[PDB]
Amino acid sequence: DPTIIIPKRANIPTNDLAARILRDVKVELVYNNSLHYVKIRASVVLDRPSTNAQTP
Amino acid sequence: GTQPIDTVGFETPMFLAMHGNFPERIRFYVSTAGMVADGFAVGSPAYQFATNAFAGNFAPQRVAIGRMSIDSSKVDFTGTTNTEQVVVNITLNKVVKAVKINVNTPAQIATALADAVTADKATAVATGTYVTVTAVSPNVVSVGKGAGVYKIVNESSETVATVLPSVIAENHNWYFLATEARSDADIVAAAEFAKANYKLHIYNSTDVDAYAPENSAASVFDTLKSLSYDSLGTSDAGADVDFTEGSVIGAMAANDPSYGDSLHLKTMPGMVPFAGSDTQRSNAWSRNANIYRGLYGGGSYIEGKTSSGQYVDVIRFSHWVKFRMEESVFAYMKRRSDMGLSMKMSDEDLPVLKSVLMNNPINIGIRNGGILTGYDNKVSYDPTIIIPKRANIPTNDLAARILRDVKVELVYNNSLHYVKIRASVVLDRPSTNAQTP
Amino acid sequence: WATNEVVDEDGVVHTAHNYTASYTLTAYRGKPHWALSRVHQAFGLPFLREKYFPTGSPYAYSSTSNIARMRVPLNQQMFENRARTIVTFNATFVEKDLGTFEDIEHIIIGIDVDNPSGPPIGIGADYDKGVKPGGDDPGLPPKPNPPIVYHDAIAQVCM
Amino acid sequence: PLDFTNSDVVMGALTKAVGRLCLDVTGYDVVEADETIPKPEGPYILVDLSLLTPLDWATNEVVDEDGVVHTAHNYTASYTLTAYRGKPHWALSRVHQAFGLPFLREKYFPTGSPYAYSSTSNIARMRVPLNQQMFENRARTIVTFNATFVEKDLGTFEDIEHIIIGIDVDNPSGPPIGIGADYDKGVKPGGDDPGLPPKPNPPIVYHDAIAQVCM
Amino acid sequence: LTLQAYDPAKVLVFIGGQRVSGFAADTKIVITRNNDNISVHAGVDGEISNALSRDNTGVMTLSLQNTAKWNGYLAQWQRQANVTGLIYLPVQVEGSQGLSLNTIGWIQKQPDLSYGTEVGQMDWEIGVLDAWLSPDQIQGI
Amino acid sequence: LTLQAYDPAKVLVFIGGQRVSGFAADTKIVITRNNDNISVHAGVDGEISNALSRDNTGVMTLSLQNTAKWNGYLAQWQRQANVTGLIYLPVQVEGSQGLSLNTIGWIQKQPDLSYGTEVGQMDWEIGVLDAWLSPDQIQGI
Amino acid sequence: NQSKILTLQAYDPAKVLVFIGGQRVSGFAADTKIVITRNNDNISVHAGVDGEISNALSRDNTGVMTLSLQNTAKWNGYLAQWQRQANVTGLIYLPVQVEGSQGLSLNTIGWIQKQPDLSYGTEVGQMDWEIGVLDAWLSPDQIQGIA
Amino acid sequence: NQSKILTLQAYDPAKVLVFIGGQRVSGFAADTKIVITRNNDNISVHAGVDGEISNALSRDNTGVMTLSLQNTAKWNGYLAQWQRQANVTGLIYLPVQVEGSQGLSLNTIGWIQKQPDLSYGTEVGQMDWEIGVLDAWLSPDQIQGIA
């Protein structure tokens, strides 16, 4: 989830107060890229061939 | 000073072979191809065992192989009969060969096998019924089974009772135990080590004293019976040449004891059906030498009893509970200490062990059906956990920072083995109280 | 009931409790009722509060009571103006414990598995501070990430 | 031989438990109301057992080996604390918070003890004139505790050794049939008769067939 | 032999492995079941037959001061489960002298949050997947 | 390290970008959800299966003195939306020490206005399109 | 009155066992587990003009059995595979058994007659499988004292 | 009891994917998302006078699928265009697929059988599109452990 973090007045340096500037506002995200390539492992057979049946 | 195994180790079987293919005391494989690459000759003992272990229905994921210093092999035809092309597979320092002897008597075949002197490094020495193969300092030789009727035997200068303490120190993440040596002393040493390190010992033997009449006998089965160990023994004809311990392990390595499942009728590919008669079967059942009877066109194990008369599955279930509780407690205690919130010794913290233990080890068993629950008589089968209070802890235990007398209790839910019926056929059918009892 | 517990590095415990402190103010001359009222409204002015009640401070303002104006005789000659009010504040108090209990270094557990094939099987389990269950075994090999290579076909099928 | 701790023991030990925790936390000196002494020097605290409330119906009955009965009742004792100098309001507050510290309580209020802490009242700070010259700082609070008191009976009733019952079965065929029934301490109804034979457990033998049918 | 006095401070709650702290005054918790034990079917002539209840879920309320640090944990656990689908955590209760409880459960509904002039309260509703009380801690049972 | 005391004056409400002011005494706000987190289906034999709730709307009450200047703004916003069809505005809440909230929402119903001998009160019902509380402001979570 | 208690042991619904093909069924719905019905009544009555009455015995005894399972149950898979199995290979029949804890039992063969209506929504659904049973005579064998 | 939890992961209805023609459907109604039914039962039973029983295998496996969409949904447009497309050009079929998050899947072809009833009122309405599916055998493939 994207997150936004903002400082408090106690953490702002006095020089920044004098200059009337706000610093260190931070944001974070994640990009959701797309697909480009696909590969397959097809197989052709003339027929088909352990029975554990126990929940892993 | 037994250190604890974890879940993966609980499935890994170890085979104590003789070879020099790697310098280490132990290695792990996930298929026979890796062993082939390491220079094990096809048809060699460890190769056969690995193939059998991977060939089961409940096969393990990985197999560990130990090393015992090899000295010289043997290709023994003594007591055999051959009317077929004898073949022997030999691997020399990553070089793979094949040997062929045609057709005749075993002594003549053994003598003719001396032709294995070309393209060699290693040496071959016939003796009229067997050929002794010995390598040279820098050479490595692996000799494996072929199409002939013969059995490969290896000798070493070491002994199991001294090799095993080295392998365990090298690595301890394995549960099952097996060996290539088949002498009574080696088998008993393996059993005594396994019973002391909480490991299951398996072995196959071909001694006919298993069949011998119950009146008296002096077989390894009987020695273990007298000593009252828990080693799981079985009598097979082809054990000495096929190392079928791998097949036995392959049928029980993967299924977890939480189901309470037993070993009674599981098919084990690679085993050869028992051949003796019913009297011999009765004899063997007395010594706890389990057999692989062939019934109704198929093969089926029989009753999986240990040396001291106890069933295998109860032992395995107890060990599984032990390891699971150890792992769960360690995990919870480590997570608690990762934060600066370490568990203290006070009455406000001790109880949580109840839920910690109920979650991982016990509740899974109750769910899957391995643990019996309900009401009996005037008793109930529900598992119980009892924990002491700070007032009851001795001052010496407080000083040492150790907690004692945490107790647990369970009931095992065994399976069914035999059934009997009383059918009756009649040409027809025959007090009327009708009052509620 | 305490609202928070802070554990020291060594295990000592610091406990925090909520409180409410009430202050009685009395103004003695001039226009006392006017004086007290301006104190009340001060808590609504943002800049003025920040000087003395900064965010994160361990006390805060809650509410105020009725302001009663009073006249008190003095020496049987004059009536003096006065007033009175009660101002309620919030607070949080922290205190430090006087020790700690011992840690759990070693745990021993006894297990008994009742079964029908024989007498109950007794077996024990143990835990130690630094002893991992598996030692340091590498475990199974991981599934490798294939290296990044060029592909001619967008989607290729090979039998 | 089945002894216990009566009310007198619990009640007297509760005061000392409060006394030690006040001394060990605030650092002040402590005094009770039971006997009067010249006022100590320096800050100090005064302890008093102002009030005591019972709960009507007993919660447990313990029967001695011989039959005597011990009855247990729940109570609630209220203690009035007063601190006389220094910063009395601060002193009392630290007593309140002490009951939230785990290790400190375990010294004086161990698990299983016959008394426990319940709640606390408002702490009022006061100024008291002295000799018409000075105002002295003080404070006051009421701390409520739980408790359980046990007492022992003064005897027992006789046991029932013999029971005689008369029975009358009214029926239409004749006059009512009178018949009696009796009980005695050691006389079993059946004497010691072995009863019917039990169903035997078959011995353990080898079986060749997994499932065998025989006609 | 000294009989216990009800100690409110030794009533413990363990959720997920840790111990809860920061309760509001008065009732720390309340445990209530959802269904009746047995269902009785009564005939015309008076025949009676009984059925055993096979739904044993309960509900446990948990009163926490709104400044408690444990509000954040429950809020995080609640939202996490809504996404992943893993909702169960162990729940265990103790009594100084009373009936204990030890099962699994989940956070059922979000309490009501209100802000005013004094530290308030939040009442969480923790579902418990079984509601059988136990006499473990009773002194003499 | 000084732990916070609950400051009622630092509970903030931002609607549409501005900050609300002019609350009535006692409870400034109340936040309540509309539905239960999980729906449990219980079988005849005791099998249990759960379903995740996919409707997460809530409701927030807002107590304002009837002389507050913010009554006019809400009245104007309410009527505007009924004509244009644009009903959503950002809503954000903070806690001095407590659980925050940050979503969008709309004015749900018109409160009840009553006139008497003293300055009254109006309780607006602000719908919030998601009702997950957040531990942002908790000191230590 | 306590002299007319019709069941001295409470009726526990979990004792009712159902086996299809030799495996025990599990994963049932909320209210009803099973329902067993016949299709045809037992005898036919042919009444004449003047009141002569004669009766006939039926020879179609087939019935239908409904089986309520939560749509998240695992047994839905086994039945779904079985349908296709029989549709192609032509082997439809399969043994069916029921245990009447404190009622009437049943033991016959049956087949899947129809597949239910699968629905997905905000709650875990339900499925009503129809297992046509070849012969539907209820058995009192579980009851003691039947002279 | 906790030993009979039929679903260890809560059933999230949003995992149920539906693809028609290769595009993912969205904009569903309030209570039910889909319903899948068959038209014909699996086999036919022909019972003789004296009790001889013989069975037949069905060869019509068509079913009907209902799809609830809010009448304000955008997907109503795609289906409405498709109807006219097929009515004139004569191409009716279109692939259909369903993902059984924790149930039974489906994968076949289908067509729009009927158009719903459009109604306008004080609340956002609803539409029930009927997507006849050519073959309606439910698939257990999503379930693990089906031996």
Side-chain angles (χ1 to χ4, degrees), chain A, chain B residues 1-80 82 84-93 96-102 104-107 109-114 116-119 122-136 138-214 216-437, chain C, chain D, chain E residues 1-140, chain F residues 1-140, chain G residues 1-145 147, chain H residues 1-145 147:
Chain A
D1 43 49
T3 301
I4 302 185
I5 288 156
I6 295 168
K8 318 191 140 72
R9 182 178 163 87
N11 303 354
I12 294 172
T14 56
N15 310 103
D16 288 333
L17 288 178
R20 299 183 171 161
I21 186 169
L22 180 76
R23 296 183 204 279
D24 314 63
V25 181
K26 299 165 192 172
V27 176
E28 301 166 32
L29 311 93
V30 174
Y31 182 81
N32 190 23
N33 55 22
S34 302
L35 178 75
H36 284 164
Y37 292 107
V38 164
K39 281 193 155 67
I40 308 173
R41 304 294 320 269
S43 66
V44 170
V45 294
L46 265 289
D47 62 357
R48 300 205 196 197
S50 184
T51 45
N52 188 249
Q54 190 173 114
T55 278
Chain B
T2 57
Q3 55 269 19
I5 73 177
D6 71 344
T7 184
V8 179
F10 189 65
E11 146 203 321
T12 298
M14 181 285 258
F15 181 74
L16 187 72
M18 269 157 293
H19 65 94
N21 284 76
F22 50 69
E24 199 49 33
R25 277 289 199 186
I26 194 173
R27 276 199 173 188
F28 302 85
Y29 303 96
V30 301
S31 65
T32 60
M35 315 173 43
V36 167
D38 277 2
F40 282 107
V42 175
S44 64
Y47 184 96
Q48 292 301 97
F49 174 90
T51 304
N52 284 335
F54 289 119
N57 279 302
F58 298 83
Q61 277 301 128
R62 71 184 199 168
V63 305
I65 309 300
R67 182 174 68 78
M68 182 163 31
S69 310
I70 184 167
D71 293 334
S72 190
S73 305
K74 281 175 170 166
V75 180
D76 173 27
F77 305 88
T78 314
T80 65
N82 282 268
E84 171 56 67
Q85 181 188 131
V86 170
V87 182
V88 190
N89 291 297
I90 292 182
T91 287
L92 173 68
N93 296 84
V96 62
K97 301 179 183 176
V99 180
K100 306 181 177 296
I101 299 291
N102 287 284
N104 294 262
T105 67
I109 291 160
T111 303
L113 184 52
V117 166
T118 63
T123 74
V125 183
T127 64
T129 70
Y130 63 88
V131 178
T132 301
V133 180
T134 317
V136 184
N139 298 121
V140 185
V141 183
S142 183
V143 185
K145 178 62 151 65
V149 173
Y150 59 88
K151 74 177 190 285
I152 303 303
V153 178
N154 295 300
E155 293 191 19
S156 171
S157 60
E158 304 189 279
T159 178
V160 179
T162 62
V163 174
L164 287 177
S166 297
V167 171
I168 194 160
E170 165 55 20
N171 194 329
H172 58 283
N173 207 279
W174 44 274
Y175 180 56
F176 299 106
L177 177 59
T179 63
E180 188 165 351
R182 301 207 176 291
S183 83
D184 303 9
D186 310 315
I187 284 176
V188 171
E192 286 195 347
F193 172 83
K195 204 252 266 184
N197 283 266
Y198 307 96
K199 313 227 163 191
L200 185 67
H201 173 212
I202 296 169
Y203 67 97
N204 289 41
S205 180
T206 316
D207 181 10
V208 183
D209 292 357
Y211 320 156
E214 177 183 1
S216 55
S219 77
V220 61
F221 300 100
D222 311 295
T223 304
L224 288 167
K225 184 82 172 294
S226 80
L227 297 183
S228 300
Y229 295 152
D230 67 350
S231 298
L232 165 60
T234 170
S235 66
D236 176 25
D240 287 351
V241 70
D242 200 22
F243 310 90
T244 325
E245 293 91 345
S247 287
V248 178
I249 285 163
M252 91 187 288
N255 61 310
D256 56 311
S258 80
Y259 280 72
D261 195 11
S262 79
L263 198 59
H264 185 51
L265 282 173
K266 284 166 172 59
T267 296
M268 310 157 156
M271 295 257 291
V272 173
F274 187 88
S277 67
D278 288 331
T279 311
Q280 291 160 300
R281 296 169 185 158
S282 172
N283 302 140
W285 181 89
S286 72
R287 311 183 196 294
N288 304 323
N290 313 286
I291 58 164
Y292 183 81
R293 285 179 65 197
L295 293 172
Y296 299 112
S300 308
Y301 205 67
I302 303 172
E303 200 157 312
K305 266 184 166 154
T306 63
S307 303
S308 73
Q310 184 57 282
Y311 283 96
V312 170
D313 46 280
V314 188
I315 298 286
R316 194 168 175 249
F317 178 87
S318 67
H319 284 157
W320 168 78
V321 170
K322 185 188 195 286
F323 303 136
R324 278 295 197 109
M325 296 189 35
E326 289 164 355
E327 211 177 4
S328 180
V329 172
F330 173 81
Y332 166 65
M333 269 308 337
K334 164 70 169 32
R335 193 174 71 226
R336 274 288 302 253
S337 208
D338 272 351
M339 304 129 77
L341 202 60
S342 61
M343 156 96 64
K344 296 296 183 290
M345 202 156 257
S346 87
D347 308 285
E348 296 180 47
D349 278 288
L350 290 167
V352 180
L353 301 175
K354 267 202 273 300
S355 57
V356 172
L357 296 175
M358 266 283 138
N359 179 22
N360 180 358
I362 288 161
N363 249 358
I364 308 174
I366 291 176
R367 182 192 305 134
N368 284 338
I371 296 164
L372 193 72
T373 46
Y375 177 101
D376 200 281
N377 204 2
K378 311 308 154 302
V379 181
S380 65
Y381 307 137
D382 43 49
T384 301
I385 302 185
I386 288 156
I387 295 168
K389 318 191 140 72
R390 182 178 163 87
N392 303 354
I393 294 172
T395 56
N396 310 103
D397 288 333
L398 288 178
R401 299 183 171 161
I402 186 169
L403 180 76
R404 296 183 204 279
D405 314 63
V406 181
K407 299 165 192 172
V408 176
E409 301 166 32
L410 311 93
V411 174
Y412 182 81
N413 190 23
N414 55 22
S415 302
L416 178 75
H417 284 164
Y418 292 107
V419 164
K420 281 193 155 67
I421 308 173
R422 304 294 320 269
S424 66
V425 170
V426 294
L427 265 289
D428 62 357
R429 300 205 196 197
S431 184
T432 45
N433 188 249
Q435 190 173 114
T436 278
Chain C
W1 277 312
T3 60
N4 293 76
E5 293 202 327
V6 185
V7 175
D8 200 338
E9 53 206 290
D10 68 346
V12 168
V13 186
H14 309 86
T15 304
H17 276 110
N18 286 87
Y19 273 72
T20 70
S22 293
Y23 279 96
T24 295
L25 322 182
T26 312
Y28 269 82
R29 289 184 269 219
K31 266 147 87 174
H33 58 291
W34 163 89
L36 297 178
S37 177
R38 285 195 76 244
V39 165
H40 177 273
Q41 285 154 14
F43 289 102
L45 301 173
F47 178 44
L48 196 150
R49 277 190 291 114
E50 184 91 11
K51 304 179 193 162
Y52 309 124
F53 294 79
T55 57
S57 54
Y59 43 68
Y61 165 77
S62 187
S63 72
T64 308
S65 194
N66 295 31
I67 303 156
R69 175 174 163 263
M70 292 142 41
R71 288 167 77 208
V72 174
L74 300 177
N75 292 17
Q76 314 162 339
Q77 295 163 50
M78 180 178 73
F79 275 89
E80 181 185 49
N81 292 315
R82 304 194 177 160
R84 189 207 300 293
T85 187
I86 308 183
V87 177
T88 308
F89 295 81
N90 285 339
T92 192
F93 293 177
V94 182
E95 268 301 341
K96 183 169 73 66
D97 201 8
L98 267 62
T100 77
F101 301 96
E102 291 73 8
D103 299 334
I104 289 290
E105 295 179 353
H106 300 75
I107 304 174
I108 292 156
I109 310 180
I111 306 167
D112 312 323
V113 178
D114 293 336
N115 68 88
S117 82
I121 292 175
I123 203 162
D126 292 331
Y127 154 78
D128 293 334
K129 52 171 40 169
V131 180
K132 274 193 53 46
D136 64 354
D137 186 74
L140 288 161
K143 80 171 195 312
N145 302 263
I148 297 161
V149 177
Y150 161 78
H151 312 267
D152 302 86
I154 307 308
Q156 67 166 35
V157 190
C158 294
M159 266 66 66
Chain D
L2 195 142
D3 284 314
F4 63 92
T5 57
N6 59 302
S7 314
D8 191 11
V9 177
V10 175
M11 182 179 72
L14 178 46
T15 46
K16 290 190 284 187
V18 171
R20 285 187 193 107
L21 190 148
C22 287
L23 176 62
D24 213 320
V25 165
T26 71
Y28 287 14
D29 201 354
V30 177
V31 166
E32 289 82 3
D34 189 358
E35 293 82 3
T36 184
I37 59 166
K39 184 166 174 180
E41 201 66 279
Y44 69 102
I45 291 177
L46 177 71
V47 171
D48 181 359
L49 172 45
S50 57
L51 181 138
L52 173 56
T53 71
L55 300 195
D56 194 51
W57 277 312
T59 60
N60 293 76
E61 293 202 327
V62 185
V63 175
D64 200 338
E65 53 206 290
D66 68 346
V68 168
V69 186
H70 309 86
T71 304
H73 276 110
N74 286 87
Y75 273 72
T76 70
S78 293
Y79 279 96
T80 295
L81 322 182
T82 312
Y84 269 82
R85 289 184 269 219
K87 266 147 87 174
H89 58 291
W90 163 89
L92 297 178
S93 177
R94 285 195 76 244
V95 165
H96 177 273
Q97 285 154 14
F99 289 102
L101 301 173
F103 178 44
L104 196 150
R105 277 190 291 114
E106 184 91 11
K107 304 179 193 162
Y108 309 124
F109 294 79
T111 57
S113 54
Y115 43 68
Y117 165 77
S118 187
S119 72
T120 308
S121 194
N122 295 31
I123 303 156
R125 175 174 163 263
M126 292 142 41
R127 288 167 77 208
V128 174
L130 300 177
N131 292 17
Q132 314 162 339
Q133 295 163 50
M134 180 178 73
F135 275 89
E136 181 185 49
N137 292 315
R138 304 194 177 160
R140 189 207 300 293
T141 187
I142 308 183
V143 177
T144 308
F145 295 81
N146 285 339
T148 192
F149 293 177
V150 182
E151 268 301 341
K152 183 169 73 66
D153 201 8
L154 267 62
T156 77
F157 301 96
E158 291 73 8
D159 299 334
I160 289 290
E161 295 179 353
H162 300 75
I163 304 174
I164 292 156
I165 310 180
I167 306 167
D168 312 323
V169 178
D170 293 336
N171 68 88
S173 82
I177 292 175
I179 203 162
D182 292 331
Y183 154 78
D184 293 334
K185 52 171 40 169
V187 180
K188 274 193 53 46
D192 64 354
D193 186 74
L196 288 161
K199 80 171 195 312
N201 302 263
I204 297 161
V205 177
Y206 161 78
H207 312 267
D208 302 86
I210 307 308
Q212 67 166 35
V213 190
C214 294
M215 266 66 66
Chain E
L1 189 82
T2 60
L3 291 182
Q4 280 191 96
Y6 168 79
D7 183 345
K10 285 315 211 293
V11 172
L12 308 174
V13 187
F14 301 108
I15 306 190
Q18 279 73 25
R19 176 168 48 81
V20 178
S21 56
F23 296 111
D26 262 8
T27 61
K28 297 172 72 172
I29 66 170
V30 175
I31 313 179
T32 187
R33 269 181 63 102
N34 267 19
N35 294 37
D36 197 331
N37 285 325
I38 294 195
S39 315
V40 59
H41 182 184
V44 179
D45 290 325
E47 289 91 4
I48 288 281
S49 72
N50 298 103
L52 296 179
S53 191
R54 286 279 160 259
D55 185 76
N56 307 343
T57 63
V59 168
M60 181 206 318
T61 287
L62 206 67
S63 303
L64 282 152
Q65 298 181 47
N66 46 308
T67 71
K69 186 180 289 293
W70 263 86
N71 282 321
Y73 298 176
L74 295 187
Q76 290 183 299
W77 174 28
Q78 165 184 257
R79 195 178 35 230
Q80 195 85 357
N82 166 265
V83 173
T84 68
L86 309 178
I87 61 170
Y88 288 123
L89 273 184
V91 172
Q92 172 179 356
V93 183
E94 314 296 351
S96 49
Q97 187 139 5
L99 296 176
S100 308
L101 179 135
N102 175 295
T103 81
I104 58 182
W106 73 97
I107 287 167
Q108 174 163 282
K109 189 180 178 74
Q110 180 175 277
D112 273 308
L113 170 69
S114 62
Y115 277 118
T117 42
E118 310 190 35
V119 191
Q121 201 173 306
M122 283 200 300
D123 292 355
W124 298 87
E125 280 155 300
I126 308 293
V128 297
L129 185 60
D130 277 292
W132 293 117
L133 276 62
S134 185
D136 307 354
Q137 310 270 337
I138 300 294
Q139 191 183 6
Chain F
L1 189 82
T2 60
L3 291 182
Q4 280 191 96
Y6 168 79
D7 183 345
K10 285 315 211 293
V11 172
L12 308 174
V13 187
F14 301 108
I15 306 190
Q18 279 73 25
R19 176 168 48 81
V20 178
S21 56
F23 296 111
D26 262 8
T27 61
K28 297 172 72 172
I29 66 170
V30 175
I31 313 179
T32 187
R33 269 181 63 102
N34 267 19
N35 294 37
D36 197 331
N37 285 325
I38 294 195
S39 315
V40 59
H41 182 184
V44 179
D45 290 325
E47 289 91 4
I48 288 281
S49 72
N50 298 103
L52 296 179
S53 191
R54 286 279 160 259
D55 185 76
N56 307 343
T57 63
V59 168
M60 181 206 318
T61 287
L62 206 67
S63 303
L64 282 152
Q65 298 181 47
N66 46 308
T67 71
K69 186 180 289 293
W70 263 86
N71 282 321
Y73 298 176
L74 295 187
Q76 290 183 299
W77 174 28
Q78 165 183 257
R79 195 178 35 230
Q80 195 85 357
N82 166 265
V83 173
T84 68
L86 309 178
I87 61 170
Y88 288 123
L89 273 184
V91 172
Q92 172 179 356
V93 183
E94 314 296 351
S96 48
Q97 187 139 5
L99 296 176
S100 308
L101 179 135
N102 175 295
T103 81
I104 58 182
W106 73 97
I107 287 167
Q108 174 163 282
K109 189 180 178 74
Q110 180 175 277
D112 273 308
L113 170 69
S114 62
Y115 277 118
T117 42
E118 310 190 35
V119 191
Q121 201 173 306
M122 283 200 300
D123 292 356
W124 298 87
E125 280 155 300
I126 308 293
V128 297
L129 185 60
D130 277 292
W132 293 117
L133 276 62
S134 185
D136 307 354
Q137 310 270 337
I138 300 294
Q139 191 183 6
Chain G
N1 214 348
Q2 52 252 38
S3 68
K4 311 165 163 213
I5 288 162
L6 194 52
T7 179
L8 294 167
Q9 266 188 56
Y11 157 83
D12 176 74
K15 294 289 105 181
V16 187
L17 318 180
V18 179
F19 304 94
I20 315 185
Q23 270 64 81
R24 179 163 179 255
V25 178
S26 66
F28 287 108
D31 175 52
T32 300
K33 286 172 56 162
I34 62 170
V35 184
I36 307 167
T37 66
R38 298 271 294 289
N39 296 133
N40 297 115
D41 63 298
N42 291 358
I43 62 170
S44 306
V45 177
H46 187 188
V49 170
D50 73 358
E52 300 148 302
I53 289 281
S54 76
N55 292 313
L57 303 182
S58 71
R59 287 283 167 257
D60 283 278
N61 309 327
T62 61
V64 180
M65 183 177 176
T66 285
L67 205 47
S68 301
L69 301 175
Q70 296 182 36
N71 68 7
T72 189
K74 204 172 61 43
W75 259 87
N76 296 297
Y78 301 165
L79 297 162
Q81 298 201 44
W82 186 248
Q83 283 193 92
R84 285 193 313 252
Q85 203 74 330
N87 192 14
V88 178
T89 71
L91 303 182
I92 51 180
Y93 288 107
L94 203 66
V96 173
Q97 182 181 330
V98 179
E99 301 306 79
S101 73
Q102 284 193 290
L104 294 80
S105 309
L106 180 79
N107 175 22
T108 192
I109 60 175
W111 67 89
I112 297 165
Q113 193 171 271
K114 207 179 160 94
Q115 62 153 312
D117 288 19
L118 175 66
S119 57
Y120 285 121
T122 59
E123 294 293 328
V124 187
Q126 164 176 326
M127 281 211 196
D128 296 342
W129 293 91
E130 290 188 305
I131 310 305
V133 290
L134 191 65
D135 189 358
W137 294 117
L138 299 169
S139 167
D141 183 278
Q142 303 264 320
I143 297 169
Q144 290 78 46
Chain H
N1 214 348
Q2 52 252 38
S3 68
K4 311 165 163 213
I5 288 162
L6 194 52
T7 179
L8 294 167
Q9 266 188 56
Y11 157 83
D12 176 74
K15 294 289 105 181
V16 187
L17 318 180
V18 179
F19 304 94
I20 315 185
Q23 270 64 81
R24 179 163 179 255
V25 178
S26 66
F28 287 108
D31 175 52
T32 300
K33 286 172 56 162
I34 62 170
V35 184
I36 307 167
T37 66
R38 298 271 294 289
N39 296 133
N40 297 115
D41 63 298
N42 291 358
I43 62 170
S44 306
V45 177
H46 187 188
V49 170
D50 73 358
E52 300 148 302
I53 289 281
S54 76
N55 292 314
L57 303 182
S58 71
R59 287 283 167 257
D60 283 278
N61 309 327
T62 61
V64 180
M65 183 177 176
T66 285
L67 205 47
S68 301
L69 301 175
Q70 296 182 36
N71 68 7
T72 189
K74 204 172 61 43
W75 259 87
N76 296 297
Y78 301 165
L79 297 162
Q81 298 201 44
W82 186 248
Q83 283 193 92
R84 285 193 313 252
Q85 203 74 330
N87 192 14
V88 178
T89 71
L91 303 182
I92 51 179
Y93 288 107
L94 203 66
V96 173
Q97 182 181 330
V98 179
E99 301 306 79
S101 73
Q102 284 193 290
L104 294 80
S105 309
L106 180 79
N107 175 22
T108 192
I109 60 175
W111 67 89
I112 297 165
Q113 193 171 271
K114 207 179 160 94
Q115 62 153 312
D117 288 19
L118 175 66
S119 57
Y120 285 121
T122 59
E123 294 293 328
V124 187
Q126 164 176 326
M127 281 211 196
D128 296 342
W129 293 91
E130 290 188 305
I131 310 305
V133 290
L134 191 65
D135 189 358
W137 294 117
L138 299 169
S139 167
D141 183 278
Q142 303 264 320
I143 297 169
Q144 290 78 46

